[PDB]
Amino acid sequence: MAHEAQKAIARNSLLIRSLPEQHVDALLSQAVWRSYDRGETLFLQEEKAQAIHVVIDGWVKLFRMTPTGSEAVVSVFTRGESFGEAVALRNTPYPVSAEAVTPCEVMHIPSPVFVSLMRRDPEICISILATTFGHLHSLVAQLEQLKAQTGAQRVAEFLLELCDCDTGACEVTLPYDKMLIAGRLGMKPESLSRAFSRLKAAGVTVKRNHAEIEDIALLRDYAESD
Amino acid sequence: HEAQKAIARNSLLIRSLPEQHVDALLSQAVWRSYDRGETLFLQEEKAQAIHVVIDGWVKLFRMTPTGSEAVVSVFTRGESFGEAVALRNTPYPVSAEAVTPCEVMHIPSPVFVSLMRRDPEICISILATTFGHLHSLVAQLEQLKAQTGAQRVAEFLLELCDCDTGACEVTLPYDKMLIAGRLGMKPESLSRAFSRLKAAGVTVKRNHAEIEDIALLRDYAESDSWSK
Ligand SMILES: [Cl-]
Numbered sequence: 001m002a003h004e005a006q007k008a009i010a011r012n013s014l015l016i017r018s019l020p021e022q023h024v025d026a027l028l029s030q031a032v033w034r035s036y037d038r039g040e041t042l043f044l045q046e047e048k049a050q051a052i053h054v055v056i057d058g059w060v061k062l063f064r065m066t067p068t069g070s071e072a073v074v075s076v077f078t079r080g081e082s083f084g085e086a087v088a089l090r091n092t093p094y095p096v097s098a099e100a101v102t103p104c105e106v107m108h109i110p111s112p113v114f115v116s117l118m119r120r121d122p123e124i125c126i127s128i129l130a131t132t133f134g135h136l137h138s139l140v141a142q143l144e145q146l147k148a149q150t151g152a153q154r155v156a157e158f159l160l161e162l163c164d165c166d167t168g169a170c171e172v173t174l175p176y177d178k179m180l181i182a183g184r185l186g187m188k189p190e191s192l193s194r195a196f197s198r199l200k201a202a203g204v205t206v207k208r209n210h211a212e213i214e215d216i217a218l219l220r221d222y223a224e225s226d
Numbered sequence: 227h228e229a230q231k232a233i234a235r236n237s238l239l240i241r242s243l244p245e246q247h248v249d250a251l252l253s254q255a256v257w258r259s260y261d262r263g264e265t266l267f268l269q270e271e272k273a274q275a276i277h278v279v280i281d282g283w284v285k286l287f288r289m290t291p292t293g294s295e296a297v298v299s300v301f302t303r304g305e306s307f308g309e310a311v312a313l314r315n316t317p318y319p320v321s322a323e324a325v326t327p328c329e330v331m332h333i334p335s336p337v338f339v340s341l342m343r344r345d346p347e348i349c350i351s352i353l354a355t356t357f358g359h360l361h362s363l364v365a366q367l368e369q370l371k372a373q374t375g376a377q378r379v380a381e382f383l384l385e386l387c388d389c390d391t392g393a394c395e396v397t398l399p400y401d402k403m404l405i406a407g408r409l410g411m412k413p414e415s416l417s418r419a420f421s422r423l424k425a426a427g428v429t430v431k432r433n434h435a436e437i438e439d440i441a442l443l444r445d446y447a448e449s450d451s452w453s454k
């Protein structure tokens with residue numbers, strides 16, 4: 001009933017990071033909390049965009065229906081990540097469907113709660129926009145400086161970012177279907193496997209539904225190498 | 227100023243706006259030219275405009291506590307800056323100065339802010355666009371980069387040309403360290419990179435770079451060493 005740990009996780013989302021601190025808790029106080037089993041749908045393409053979504057635990061995939069009826073995976077999101085901001089603010093119908101890929105918990109911020117806040121007080125929207133512009137310039141600068149690295153280094157970094165702590169050993173849940181991560185990391189399915197094999201030597205075991213980092217420092221050291 | 231207005235539309239600032247309001251905002255622009263070394267603004271002054279570079283290079287810098295210029299950013303043709311500080315009405319954290327002669331478009335802040343105070347739906351619309359772009363940039367930062375330094379330099383150059391075919395010359399600052407910093411490259415490497423780009427028809431002079439063939443430079447950049 002406090003959702004203290006869960007709100008702490010939500011504060012790392014793009015949505016929550018963009019808000020001025022004075023308004024964070026009041027917005028989180030109006031959250032709609034839900035759990036989903038593996039395979040369960042959060043929403044379907046063309047439905048009304050009733051909320052902004054923040055994954056607290058698990059993996060959620062977004063997919064679009066193609067003209068020939070296949071499902072194209074557009075994104076995969078996990079712990080501490082938000083999605084749906086733009087569609088919610090424009091009030092356009094969902095352009096994708098969303099489905100729990102693992103069992104998961106989501107914090108939903110109802111669209112009217114967030115939109116109405118901004119219709120009421122323009123100072124809030126101006127203030128959030130200021131923050132998002134700064135964040136944009138910052139990401140563009142990171143892209144301009146992004147150097148090449150190895151696929152294994154990408155996967156290490158990814159895995160490191162999924163742990164949150166700086167020391168010890170660790171478990172991280174991963175989807176069964178490994179193509180989801182490959183898409184997210186912009187890698188070939190082979191390359192990801194190749195990448196995994198190479199990480200054995202850095203202390204990483206990759207089971208069917210989870211990965212294990214024997215030691216963070218070693219992995220972190222592997223990621224920060226030639 | 228239609229050609230100059232066209233270049234401004236490439237900026238982060240103008241891209242993010244509702245298309246149906248652009249022209250009226252662009253209509254209240256103050257256009258200014260700057261000599262090399264001329265100040266655009268200085269640290270602690272009031273942010274009263276958002277700036278878009280129309281031509282040339284502008285560097286932003288802070289003073290180290292021991293009194294040294296520490297360059298923070300360099301902006302060129304079609305790029306905007308000062309959005310956040312102007313919308314927050316806080317003092318400038320840096321100074322800005324023309325590295326080359328330049329043209330810049332200034333958007334008075336009150337023009338922009340009063341529009342949103344009058345109709346918060348404008349800001350709601352702009353914010354939707356800035357969130358979608360944020361997501362796109364974050365997605366792109368997770369995807370494996372494989373390109374070499376010379377390829378990155380190649381892409382940097384290609385993006386400065388704005389034409390898909392033929393030849394172009396792009397103004398570059400005299401001091402190539404400003405580009406090195408922007409690309410997150412050791413100055414050594416930037417030079418090493420320019421050497422390797424000789425093969426793709428890129429000759430780098432004092433105040434400019436000459437691209438003999440765009441398509442050929444795009445080919446080097448896209449390649450997975452290499453040859454003409
Ligand atoms: Cl399960």
Ligand SMILES: [Cl-]
Pocket residue numbers: 256257
């Ligand atoms: Cl004037």
